[PDB]
Structure 1
């Protein structure tokens, strides 16, 4: 049976890309808190 997870770079970068996240103020706060925590990779490394 087809699994729930279907990898797609375009979908991933369009739904959780850096620019897409920064576009909305909520994503800006998410990025700020992730930086405060100290995550090695904020959203994704292309």
Structure 2
């Protein structure tokens, strides 16, 4: 029950994906900021 964008582009997920965001302190900062704003969608 969601919306998916390019569910086959692997490079999209390897650049802007959740596991790449969680692999460095700066990406975790990005995720923290987006959680603070209240975004419905975190990362790709």
TM-score, reference length from structure 2: 0.76
Two-structure CA RMSD over aligned residues (Å): 1.4
- How many pairs align? 38
Higher-Rg member (1/2): 1
Which structure has the highest helix share of the two? 1
Runs of 4+ in 1 over 4 A off after TM superposition: none
| Aligned positions of 1:1-40 closer than 5 A | 9-40=9-40
Structure 1: gaps (5+ residues)? 1-6
Indicate the structure whose relative CO is greater, using CA pairs within 8 Å and at least 6 residues apart: 2
Structure 2: gaps (5+ residues)? 1-5
